């Protein structure tokens, strides 16, 4: 029953960990913004994988967590919402029966087992739960709660963040425009090189190598973003070689839990490096 599910999840996790460093995060996290003025938060769709390898899916197997009561955080201006799933106890009972425990239990019984999913906040004591960021609520000039548009959770898929998708589609368009212009900027059905060509052919090799690879990663954006990071960082590294004043330390390190400090800075860096292409147009 519950015994097969236990360590079966460990087998799938151990397989994911052969190709990925952090096989956990959000796939989908959708909310009902309508009850924010009434200080009530509700999830509509949640597909989240916890760091122990547990997959929760409200579209198929799981039931949406109960409403998040924001009455408790009236004194706050920022609240970080997490999805919580109680830890699995190797020694204990993970079934929520009548008896009270000092810790939450993974499952409840229903007319079969149902996961005890709840929405909690990062400022709470959550060590008795497995946790994953799902939104950040910030207040406006009116002082009403509103989901922070800049929020990006630990990602299992690129598609989990539509803002990042936008920022990436934009970066790919910028790269295509700069490649097409620089490819036109090369010169009888043959070519003789110059000092100006040295830099041009460095940039062209960098852009032409990356374009097909980033295009395929973005056509199907349902893979783990460690793949995208590696190829994005590979490009950033290649581009900041002919740029003095820029160290290879500019490329943000991959940190899974905080993608806001890895993908927005890296895409910005890349967009800046793409604009910084100057071909000495006034040299006669």
């Amino acid at each position: 029953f519950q015994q097969q599910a236990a360590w079966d999840v460990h087998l799938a996790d151990s397989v994911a960990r052969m190709g990925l460093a952090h096989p956990w995060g959000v796939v989908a996290a959708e909310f009902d913004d309508s009850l924010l003025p009434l200080s009530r938060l509700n999830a509509t769709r949640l597909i989240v994988r916890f760091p122990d390898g547990t997959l929760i899916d409200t579209e198929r197997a799981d039931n949406l967590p109960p409403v998040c009561d924001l009455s408790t955080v009236s004194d706050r201006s920022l609240v970080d919402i997490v999805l919580a799933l109680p830890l699995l106890n190797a020694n204990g009972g993970n079934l929520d029966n009548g008896s009270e425990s000092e810790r939450p239990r993974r499952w409840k019984s229903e007319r079969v087992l149902r996961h005890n999913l709840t929405l909690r906040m990062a400022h709470q004591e959550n060590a008795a739960w497995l946790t994953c960021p799902v939104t950040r609520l910030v207040r406006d000039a009116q002082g009403q709660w509103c989901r922070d548009p800049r929020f990006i959770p630990p990602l299992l898929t690129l598609s989990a963040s539509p803002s990042l998708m936008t920022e990436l589609l934009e970066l790919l368009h910028h790269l295509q425009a700069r490649r097409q212009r620089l490819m036109s900027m090369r010169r009888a059905r043959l070519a003789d090189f110059a000092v100006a060509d040295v830099s041009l052919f460095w940039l062209l090799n960098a852009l032409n190598s990356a374009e097909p690879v980033l295009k395929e990663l973005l056509d199907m954006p349902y893979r783990h973003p460690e793949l995208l990071y590696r190829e994005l960082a590979r490009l950033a590294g290649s581009l900041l070689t002919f740029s003095l004043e820029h160290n290879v330390d500019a490329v943000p390190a991959y940190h899974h839990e905080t993608p806001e400090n890895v993908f927005p800075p890296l895409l910005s860096l890349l967009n800046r490096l793409l604009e910084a292409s100057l071909p000495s147009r006034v040299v006669f």
Partner: nanobody
Amino acid sequence: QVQLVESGGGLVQAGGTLKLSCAASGSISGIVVMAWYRQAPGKQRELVASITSGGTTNYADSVKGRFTISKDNAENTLYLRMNSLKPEDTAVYYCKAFFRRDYVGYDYWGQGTQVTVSS
């Protein structure tokens, strides 16, 4: 792994006081929450009070207003101050430790300490 040892149990009259102690050793760093449980003769083991590693206390309705759970982090000792004792508080008291190691939870228990409250 964590090792727990209870002391301080005994015989007291109604309205009396006892302080139970629970010495913790081992991988104390993974302790998420510590608790006190009790098992009366014939009845099942019930939760009495709990204290999170951050110091948040919680009590069963029967002991709320009378008992106090506290932690001495320096001495790695959990305490239970039982005041306003009632004969219904007669049971074997166990201290528990809820430990967390790499996304899995584990329960550790003490041997038990007898508490007898007389009329």
